[model samples]
Target: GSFVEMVDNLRGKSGQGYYVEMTVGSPPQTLNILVDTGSSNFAVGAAPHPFLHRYYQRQLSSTYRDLRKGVYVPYTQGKWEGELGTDLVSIPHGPNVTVRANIAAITESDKFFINGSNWEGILGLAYAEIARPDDSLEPFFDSLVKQTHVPNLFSLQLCGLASVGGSMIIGGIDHSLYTGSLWYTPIRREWYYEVIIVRVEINGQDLKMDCKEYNYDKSIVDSGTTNLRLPKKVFEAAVKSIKAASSTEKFPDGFWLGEQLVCWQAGTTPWNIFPVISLYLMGEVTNQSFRITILPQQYLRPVSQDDCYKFAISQSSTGTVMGAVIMEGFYVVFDRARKRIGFAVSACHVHDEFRTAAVEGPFVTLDMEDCGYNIPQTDESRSHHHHH
Candidate 1:
């Protein structure tokens, strides 16, 4: 059976991690669990987890079956080490539907587990390709697809700083959560839900994007992380464009020892005056491209109230991380069976103006308001959300 779980915009040590409530074992031990599409495996916490509000005691759950196995994996903020076991997993839905699942209850955690983060575990949504540090059988979504009548599609409604609520629509899309038409793009790869980005621009200036045809692959669309990550060259070009448009030559570093963590005084941030950051993804149909427009407020996440930084980060490492920062105001659907992903504007996008650059000047084009969907301006025609 399909179910919709209430998602909370968790604000603790790091800020803005979305989680849902779920239960485990036969008697039902409830816990706050993070929804991570970038990874696989159902990982929870055991004793000695300083930041966890709930624990998974092997001796407690009557349905617990020890596999006598263990694993260690790295999260964006920390590392997790735990033992493998099979238990009755259930979602907090009508009557609490339960099923037997193989999961990892983290026994030890590193510094990434922030002290104030009460989040108890992670429910991975991605495929098995990149799932590591464990012998995780089938991912949670895949398991649902096979075991129940749940559809292969799931949508995410991420909240903004000013917004209060968010929800993960399982089995199918909640059309009321988005407006206009949802654009579809094929998942270039099964793992990581990575897709091919056809084009990128900052304030109308087109930035060059390369697709790997040889030994390498392309970018990933990750829901687990908050910020966005772009290639080094493109990131540099976009930074210069932001500086030029804002009329600020030197940027400030507000985070401690953050010689590299970029920032601007929140009040004087030039996002309002700057052009928007536009991303174009290759669609399922040949030459079909879908656009994801991010407003300034959605892209500029705050480290604190006084300082705000562009959530897009540049790295010399792998491909881009189309993280939650960019996906905030947009309705996103991960369609595994059809090998596609969908995007549409949501209510969470508070700021109408959003776009920006790499080393080149500001390149912007095609505002969502002008997407030409013929969608009326009425409230019913618009389905969007806002956040923390």
Candidate 2:
């Protein structure tokens, strides 16, 4: 009945992703694993890996059990091969309860392991609909909900650029994290927190395109990803619109493509000249909508060296993805219990940091239909084995 609050300490500024420390196995091995909502697999570095500083020593854990089942997950840029196993997992900074759960003891991977990344593995927070191998294997969160009998919901507070830490509350929402009431958005599909992005606005003006294009293929809220990935057409329109709306001088074409960084002298004003970008989502009612807006400080992300900033919006081959760049501005709730996602102004937004985030209301819209709801599931239909 209570929430298991876990500290989500970020590794670096947009370096990797938010990760949580957990004790797995007997005489538990503490490891930092990335929290990912895009995929569903609670995997750890079990065997030796060149890029990894340490791994889960399965031999040392007396309670570890190998399921002898092979599992492989191929991501957009990397792939990992491992075996399925069972272990006792518990969050040290969370609630005092340990749950036996399924875990992938990854032994080999390609570009999945970055040279300087701190996370040893990934904690996929998505639903079982996209679980690797097959949905027959329940996801880590589902198992946690089943064994511990906690509420089937979790909320994420990805701190803005000004802070270095956040929190992930499982089983319930923390009313203290946000100042206002939560705004709910309908989840179009059960996988990947898929939702309808009804419109894209710049400087309070709507983009010149069919609103349905905002969710051409699909739009999702993925905590593991770093940028706000727009579909090719949507990306081009946003870039062109940003250029027209802002008084900032031109940089190379690579800057908007996320290939290059642009810097300004200390105390100079680049963010001042940039326009705010907003994504409007379909609200609970057919003719209702809510939006999350990000200021230049968010899209023009600050980098490590110099006063340099990288464009946080990028082109995506997949659907539109609202990643950490967008989520940092609000407290996002994955309320599976009600089959909807909620957004609220975060307590972090009130910090002394620059105004990077904003959440608007249940504005009345002229359109009565849901966006992206009519799109055929041809590509994603493969996931449902019963398609035959």
Candidate 3:
């Protein structure tokens, strides 16, 4: 099927994220790169930073071509600056083909590289429409497709606590990593692998909001973001249900805001007390919907000790960003050529004792004429796009 099997052989711990290794430049310097579906630039560390264990020494690579153009990418919490360049890149334990791709050699950063992190770079998997400096630049995957003539698609199986490892299949889907058939939703926008969320439910109870609100601004499937970010109104109602279900009033204000962690006596199980968060998405079929559910383990992340955990859901003023919290349990397929995203239950998502997340449904959609009707057509519609 013309697919590139990019196995996650170098899956290492990087605080809250996982990464794969890529062989770049002439002598083949292998650098661990965090896979992010949120941004567009394939940026790697060019200069040594405090948090980074190692960086790409551009001088050592004979094939490296300095474009000299500047590139900058901003995140919700951090940002980085770099110079544009081109170099040979190939996935280790992946496809045999090697492609020369546009590379952003990061020279400086602010809060982007955290302390004790091992990944030296970030591989942005989104379209070129959101590339830094300008959209004229070709993203990693786009360059891969253009040069290799592979299928214009990629599938991600993000294993959270269960296996602590997952794989990314470039060019096609891998049925062995998932169970049952894949449920699909239209890619509502081109900017960020955006999709339409028709409704949100807590423990099977609907949040009771306008369908338009679910897709406020632009609901995106972002692998870079750690927590599940909901629109302000949706987050408010969702927390209310979580509070009621847990029946806990002892937690401080900052706990739900993701500022502080909550601790419990060791040997006590807290997952049983929390309700599952479910998102009903507008499916590809007319008036149809599919559901992605995240259990307590997905949202309540254990930080320091087994007894302590942090609430992994947050409020987003712009739109709902379904981060790794929601994606961990499913094998997500980004079918860019078809303009759709598909989800299937991951083989590694369920723990040995119980399930933490799931993907189900193709049920009749909510009573909304158009769920993604309000989504902006172009990236220009959002002024924040040019904030760089």
Candidate 4:
């Protein structure tokens, strides 16, 4: 299950979208694209090919057919508006690993992120329900299942900005990349692998909510997002703790960026300072409970030792988006067939160093080894000891 039918985990960009190498069209046009599990449609050319350079050209593709349909793929920063056409797409995992798929060509974009930075386009990975235009269009990973050599699953070991080098173990798990049992939760709804988060906790204490605005399955696990989306209560609480810790840090707007960045000052560590954010989730009928803890180190970003940007942002709509901030140094697996997602402790930490770590766009790999932490699947063990 470790080896893939076609594996191509190349060097990635950290500060932005995770990019992967994809060859589109019949003439074999190659391009590095953003791997967005949150998205479902695979499109290329987020910018004008001249400046962006290297994208799918419809004129050359023998299979190219303009359905006369289009979509507006929205991002946290901006959105892309273009025609949705079918084309010959391949992962090109060397000579043998030629994963040919019916891909969607972006054709064009309205406005690109920072003028079409890291990725040329997006390679959506989520289920069909999320794909725009409500068309019967199958996504990238979903189609790759039939082409894979093993199970319909892939593992990601997310590294920091330093060593973007990580591997995407397609079609299986890598024991060396993660330690402990793979604690899994069902994907109730597909848009963003929506899961039920029973509740949230700060340290050992359960979160005190004045009210509940959203459902239990409102939380979303998105690799495309950058920060952790917190509920109103927990959001205010974390900010209050940081403000008490440092008065001059400052705060501005809530939804959009202003001055608020959940950053840290010089000589201050969130370890003994900020309360650890923990999310408790349960399984479908089995009622299995699993905990995903967000440590200060995992939540805190180092823009400056004196001041760091807010890693966790506010989540009011579209539910709670569990971005990459909480996923740092963790080995996460998305099992498409099982309709479940799993998490394990990654051995590659912010401190770990590797020579010539050529990480891929957004997908990362970890050198995880067995740590012997058995997940509570039978009775769904509550390690938090819910006294409430």
TM-score of each: 0.80, 0.92, 0.91, 0.76
Task: Write candidate 4's Cα lDDT for 312-346 as tens digits.
Answer: 55544455677777666577888776888887777
- Candidate 3's C-alpha runs over 4 A off are 1-7, 10-15, 161-163, 304-306, 352-356, 366-369, 373-388
Q: Once model 4 is optimally superposed onto the true structure by TM-score, how far is the C-alpha of residue 308 displaced, in angstroms?
A: 4.3
Model with the higher TM-score, candidate 1 or 4: 1
Using lDDT, rank the candidates from best to worst: 3, 2, 1, 4
Candidate structures ordered by TM-score, highest first? 2, 3, 1, 4
Poorest 10 consecutive residues by lDDT, candidate 4: 354-363
Q: Backbone clashes in each candidate structure, one number apiece?
A: 36, 0, 0, 19
Quote the positional error of residue 2 for candidate 4 in Å. Answer: 6.5
**1-388 in candidate 2: lDDT tens per residue?**
2443354533433647888887889999999888899999999998888888889998999999989999999987888998998999987766667899899999889999866667789999898878888777888888888888678888888875432578888777888788777889987778789988778889888886787777877899998888999989999988888888663588888887788988777757556568888888889988889888887766777763358878899998788989888888888999998989999888887332454567888788767254574656587665567431
Give candidate 1 misplaced runs (Cα > 4 Å). Answer: 1-14, 93-96, 133-136, 161-164, 209-217, 253-270, 304-312, 353-388
* lDDT, candidates in the order shown: 0.64, 0.81, 0.82, 0.59
Lowest lDDT block of 10, candidate 3: 1-10
Candidate 1 lDDT over 1-388, as tens digits, reads 3333333323223334667667888688887777788789788887865466568877888899987877888876678888888787766742234667778888887864555555688888888655655223666666667777676777777765332357777777777777677777777657678776666666667665343321023567777776676666656666666556655445563321122345556676656665577777766556456567655566555556456554444442455777777767677888777898888777554554333221121223332212211213578425433221
Candidate of highest lDDT:
3
lDDT of 3 by residue, 250-333 (tens): 688899899998887786766677898889888887888888888887788767334877888999987899888888878899
**Candidate 2 regions off by >4 Å?**
1-13, 161-163, 350-356, 368-370, 373-388
Model 3 residue 125 lDDT score = 92
Clashing pairs in 3: none
